[PDB]
Amino acid sequence: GLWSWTINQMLTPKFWVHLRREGFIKTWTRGHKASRHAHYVGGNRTDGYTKQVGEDEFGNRYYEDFDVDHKNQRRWVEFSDYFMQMWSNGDKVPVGWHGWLSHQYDDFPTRTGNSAFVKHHYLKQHTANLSNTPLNHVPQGAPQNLNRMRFITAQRDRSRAPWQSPKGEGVFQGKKLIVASNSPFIDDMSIRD
Amino acid sequence: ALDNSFSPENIAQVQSSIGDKVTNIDTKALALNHQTEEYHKTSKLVYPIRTNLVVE
Amino acid sequence: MRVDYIVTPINAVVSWARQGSFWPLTFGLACCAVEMMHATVSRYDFDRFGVIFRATPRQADLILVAGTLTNKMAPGLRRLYEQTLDPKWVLSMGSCANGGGYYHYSYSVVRGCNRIIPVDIYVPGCPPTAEALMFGVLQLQKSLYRQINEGEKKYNKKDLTY
Amino acid sequence: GSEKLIEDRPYLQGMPYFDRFDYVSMMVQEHAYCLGIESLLGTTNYSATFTQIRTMYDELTRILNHLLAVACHALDVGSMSSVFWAFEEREKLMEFYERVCGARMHAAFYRPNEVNLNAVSSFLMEDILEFSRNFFTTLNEMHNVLTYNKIWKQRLINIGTYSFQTCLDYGLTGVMARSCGLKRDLRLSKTETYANYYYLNFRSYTGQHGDCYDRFLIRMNEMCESLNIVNQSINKISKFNNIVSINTKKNI
Amino acid sequence: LFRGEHALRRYPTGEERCIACKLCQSACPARAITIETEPRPDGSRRTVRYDIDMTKCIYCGFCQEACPVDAIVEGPNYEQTAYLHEDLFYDKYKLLENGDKWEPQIARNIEYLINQPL
Amino acid sequence: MQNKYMQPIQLFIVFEKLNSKMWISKKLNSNHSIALIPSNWFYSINLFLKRELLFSNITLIENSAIDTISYNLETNQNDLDKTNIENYFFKNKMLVFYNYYNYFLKSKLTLFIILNNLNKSIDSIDRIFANANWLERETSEMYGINYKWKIDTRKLLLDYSKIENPMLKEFQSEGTQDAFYNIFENQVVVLKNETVEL
Amino acid sequence: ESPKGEFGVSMLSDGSNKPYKCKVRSPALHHLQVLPKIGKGHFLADLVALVGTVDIVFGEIDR
Amino acid sequence: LNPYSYEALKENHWLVSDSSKKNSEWTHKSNAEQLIAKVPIIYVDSNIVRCIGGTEINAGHPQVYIQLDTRKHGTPQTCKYCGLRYAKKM
Amino acid sequence: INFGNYIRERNHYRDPGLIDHRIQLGYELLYEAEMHFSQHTILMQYLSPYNTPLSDRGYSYLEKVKYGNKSKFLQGFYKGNKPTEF
Amino acid sequence: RSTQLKFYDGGNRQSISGIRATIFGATGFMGPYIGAALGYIGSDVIFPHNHVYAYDDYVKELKLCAGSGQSYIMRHFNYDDDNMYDMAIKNSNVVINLVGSRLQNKNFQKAAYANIHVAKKIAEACARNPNVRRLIHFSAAGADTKSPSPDLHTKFHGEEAVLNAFPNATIFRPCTVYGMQDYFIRHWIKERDWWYHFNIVTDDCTAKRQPILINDVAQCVLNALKLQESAGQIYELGGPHVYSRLEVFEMLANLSGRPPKLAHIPHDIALKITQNFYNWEFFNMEKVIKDKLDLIVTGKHKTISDLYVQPVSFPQGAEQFIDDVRYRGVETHDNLEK
Amino acid sequence: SVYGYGISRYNEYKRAVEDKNYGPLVATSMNRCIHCTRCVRFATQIAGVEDLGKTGRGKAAEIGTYVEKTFNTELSGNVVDVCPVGALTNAPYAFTSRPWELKSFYTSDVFDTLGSAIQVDTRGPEIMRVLPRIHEEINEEWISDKTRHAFDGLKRQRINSPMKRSKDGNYEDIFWEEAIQTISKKCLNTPSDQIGAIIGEFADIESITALKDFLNRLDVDNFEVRQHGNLKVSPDFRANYLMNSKITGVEDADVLLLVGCNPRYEAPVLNARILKSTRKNLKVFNI
């Protein structure tokens, strides 16, 4: 990952401003967090670098630059996890930032203040694709489910519930076998008066 | 959870019950909006169109 | 124990290479084929991730089922899968390939390409956008990179695998 | 077995099957199905006609289909790069689909008697005009590597030549029928026209040799005329004149 | 308007919007939706089963148009690639958590779409 | 209506031994004429059409068949008269329709043939119109039509090593077999199918 | 007038909510049918070019 | 009280009740019953109340009208689309 | 002999046009078999024995020993016609 | 305990047989065939494995033994934790163990681990779970407590351990199994193709073999499941006839037309070289040791006839697997068309 | 859909009606009522009960009982089928199904000795509801509540496999072969005079024919072991034990005499027929 900032891209006022303000580790790694173009690191311009439109609950940074050579490269995100080339995929962008980054709308989430997005009490946090991990989606009757029998038995019992046969030693009156009734309803006409 | 046809007290009570900190509502503010049809809130995109830069 | 000292590093070099040049087979059925060809052109460049299409299965590394599979085509698909050089991976793209799809109740359609050949990954849409196809291909690339060393071996007291 | 399935569903459930018939040109299939249903109902879709959406999107999918056909034919002949351009310029039309129905290929947009009026906005037509202006340039770019190329001419001229007799025996219609020399366009037919086509002004092209070169040239000219038709429709749904001040003739 | 991954929504109070009317089941051209309903002990009619075979679905949006309470929607997510065929058998838990995760964006989009006729 | 129209009446003028039954409808194009033709004159009629002046400039547009053994009106059962063409869909085992376009007269012509024999036999016209080869092959394989004097009788769209007519009403859309891979044989086989139902 | 030729639907309804018969007339089928007539006597490259010239899509042909 | 008793069934639309409301996370695969039970009763001044389940039409459920003039004064009623409960004020 | 058994099972036919249609189909399937159009595991369904095991593998005679002299009805009664879990 | 197992075998891939099965050691040769035999009638099959290369076809194709929702592949199996064994067979009423020492392996400790330790763990987990009805353990025909081969010694010890832990387990001892991907015919073909001139033999080829086709072992497993009297019995499975190794070489030569050539290397040199050098599939101590031992049905236990299976003859059953390697000599002109 | 204008212009508050409780068989949603009087006329003229009516005036009038009273009666559920709207609904059949996802079969009921013609609606392997049919010689148009609703007793307490009982009373599931072999050994060992049978309430002609033929082959001619409760009627002639005047005979007769008969519980539809006939000069006497 050598030359995240090329020599021609260095000596630019943008690079020195970024290094003076942000530091070295943050400045150098900006070429690793996003790998769009050599001349695009920190923004297309040269006088200064693009201000981030926002940040993320996972640390990702979101920028929008209006001086890109093609219209489709206006908005981009730099990820907090950049361990390898071909490591950060597109499922790490949260909900509101997803719509902002896909140009569905021009609103973006904000940590504090007047928000354009609802914040209900039952909302869950965005999760990446969990396939090929121990936390994938398992149908209730699939063999991977350890409690698959409770779902199978209920589906069977919806239309055919087997009669529970007497087990073990029982009480006999001649040949009839005596057990207590299994009705949860009350025979009120035998207790009423 | 409720439209303007309900009293501000009922709307505030329901919103407090469902734990709604965002979009605060006051009985003075809800009274003016009570029984009133209004368009959606709007914003403005002000020209010139440019990039926001950081320098110095 | 001592062999691992050479095997464990070299493994990465073996994976990286096959992650850097992942050549799929030029084979497209129906209209997920059109969507895939969109995913190949300059807007979404697979050649960025070292993905280029080879026409013969002997030079292919990934089989990409991208359309409806009929009962007339199943033996051909089985032969094409068998005639690819190992190691190989299979990507199932679109509803007609993942399951029956919009023709699941038909008399001449295979109810999913995984009844004929094993499938490594499934892409759900109809058609899955080039965005989603690129996402699935990148996921498969990362998985096959990590697939050579998933911690199957145990570590002894010297922190050495088997 | 799509026809059996269509026979096994209600009318609206079979319509997306037409999207999968000729999946390069999608809304024309829906238009044909909806026209059949409307004829069986004895009515017409006035909301679609007075908004010009059906004609406009028919011409847009015409451009899509001819772009794909020309690019793939050039790729088969040996011209490798031209396929990259038509696919970029047919990505914008896919975006235009996505902005009215939320899908890039299988729209399921046309309905027998319903038009989603809210799906069509004025900001969409301006982007369509921008696309047309740049499509002129992209079509010229494809033009100057193929049309006058000696290799292209020696590969396509006097290849697959046929006359009107074969063109009738084998039921050839469309671009092939216009190449064999026959003047057959359903849009311009008095008794067979549909969806605003009879009251526009566009040209249609016929060849005089009946070979591959004629078909290629006809497809390029049809793309240009589709641009012209789209412009005419947008003009028909446009408000040009304004109110001027009584004095000084100044616009208000 | 983009048609992506399906989700089941809730009212702002947390109540399910779906009332088990089975209009979405009959609207499906692919027959991908299966619904079973029982009266919930408090009396409201809710589904005991609501599942969608995502390998049968054609992502057409006929079901979200048919829903009269905007319960079932197609979200903006398209990165739903799975490694197993069984990961694409969506049950009520999966759709409910998809709705609970993607609710802000879906709400914003639906808000704009609703305001369009107005 | 609002256009010049004329019936194709010369066809029954030349063929003097045939009854004439023609329809025009507003559900069709204003230049579309539908006629009823007996099965034992179809080849001669097509021979006349292919060569006679003001008919020679004709093309075959479409061919198919209708299984009318299960045709029932579902609504408005009391709004049927003796002149309705659908009145000929009752008690008739099979129907076959051909659609042509004439460039000189600028007309659409549909011809209907009633097949009432159990073997469903009718002469082919693929020796007159080159269109009819694939069209008639598909119709024959879909509906079990037995075409006589045909250029090619092989299956067109159906799978190898199978005999079936899936477009008959008796046929269920799921078929009777499914294709699976067999580990014990290392190749694909066909088995009796069990299918999900909604 | 579809971009590939005259595309038609011939459909008969019995009065219910489902079509009794729906037949699809596709021009790509006719173009593929005529292809052998104009391709005989040509080279393999000419055959590939001819397949390109006939704008045939097999979803419409096979359906 | 026994949920299978005559009184409990009669005052529960002849259904076996669940006071804990925790049977529905398995039978109905969600905790919506608990959440809707967490919402108190809304007291309305008039005899009839209109519910749409939201602030605007098409954001909620179709317009429904609930009677609050009951045989027993002040008996709360439940919307059949959303679980909100209303009663006449005093 | 197996294909002759097939033809014998088609002996009751008495409509000549139907027989001509069947002969056309038979010629077509034979041509498909002789030109590698079909798969061997698919075309073997017309050459397979009706009541005899195939010669390339072993066979089980368990149900022959247990249901020795029992009639066909008893054999079909002991072995059900539907799954028993549901 | 109850050994009863009622299931419906008259169904197909999408039916419900009533069998829920767990198969151990299915990443070898038997695995796919046993799994297909169980899952082709509508059973649920679980495949625990810990395979070095997860992308190998030995793992992926295990998904084909049953349909979607019926076959499951459990990865990263510990083979050392009791909890994982309990999780594997929690809802299984049938358990099959195909784990065994691999041919490349020459270490006695690893052989005991494969043949004794894993089998003991499986049997102990089966005993704890009260819903397990039948357990089928796979052993070797020539298994013996004094065998010079560590594989056979450890397999006899594993038989003892399994029968001790789960006294209702069924032991299968195949003689030698051939098929498309086997170590008998495929190894012969590949060794002749590599050593273009000969097949290497390290003995007089007088050892006896009783080959049995893979398709018959699956039928034997199904028949044993159908038979309730086989619960605590040992069965030796072999073909109809007994051949010496020389006779097998000659028969393979005659069936394909390749002229035989058996180059002889003395036994002690081969033993020393395989002992002191690295071992892989085509060069190992196990081949050298086993080539002097008879792997046949000894008659001490029950045979394949007690499972009501009629195995196919070796010449008839092995012919289709050498069709591609047939000798191309002088043929008629009509043989040019294929 | 077929006859209306197709769109509305009413833009005011609608009336709201509080729901009533009629019992566990009929569910009420009285906002849907159109005041069609079908339920009142059915209760008065068919069921014979006088609990329903219309109280109030104008738009605020309400259909139903004045006081809180259940709609307890046989043939109660029939009123649901009479009401054209969802005002009265089948309470057991609440929210479970939709009309388009059901397959229907024609059959006859066995819950009462009148073979009521019924229609069974199912979805997959689950029977969903039972509806009446038209016969005009049996049940006219109507079925009793037991016929309509007691079918859900087939979904539970089912015997699904052969079983054997030990001496201590433990039940074990066995195979068909073992059970049949055990019974066959018992049949071969037991003397003829020690063999008996009991014929059940729900026994069809084929089953009784099979059992009779088998026991006759075993030289057994006794088909009862119970000491009391046997019918003292000879099977020599069909007229001995049958309804010789048929179900419609109540319309033909002018004097009916019941002897130990309670038609209200044993045949509610026949009771409704007798009520209709008594409205037309039929006299009923009871012993």
Ligand SMILES: NC(=O)C1=CN([C@@H]2O[C@H](COP(=O)(O)OP(=O)(O)OC[C@H]3O[C@@H](n4cnc5c(N)ncnc54)[C@H](OP(=O)(O)O)[C@@H]3O)[C@@H](O)[C@H]2O)C=CC1
């Ligand atoms: N096939 C034959 O000719 C005969 C075979 N047998 C026996 O039948 C059984 C099945 O046969 P087959 O499939 O051909 O044999 P294989 O050698 O091909 O397969 C052995 C299986 O056991 C697993 N295994 C091996 N060592 C270990 C270990 N230490 N820990 C965990 N798992 C292990 C392997 O998995 P992995 O290595 O991937 O971890 C593989 O799944 C074996 O026990 C074999 O000895 C008996 C007679 C004849």
Ligand code: SF4
């Ligand atoms: S899943 Fe759908 S869009 Fe994809 S190839 Fe199939 S029919 Fe076309």
Ligand code: SF4
């Ligand atoms: S369409 Fe909507 S309200 Fe109806 S059953 Fe489906 S999710 Fe529920």
Ligand code: SF4
């Ligand atoms: S999007 Fe269409 S195909 Fe998919 S579940 Fe909804 S209705 Fe069915």
Ligand code: SF4
């Ligand atoms: S049947 Fe219904 S609408 Fe008619 S009077 Fe009764 S409750 Fe009212």
Ligand code: SF4
């Ligand atoms: S289904 Fe009928 S009774 Fe029910 S509300 Fe709608 S129109 Fe009225």
Ligand SMILES: [Zn+2]
């Ligand atoms: Zn409400």
Ligand SMILES: [Zn+2]
């Ligand atoms: Zn020992």
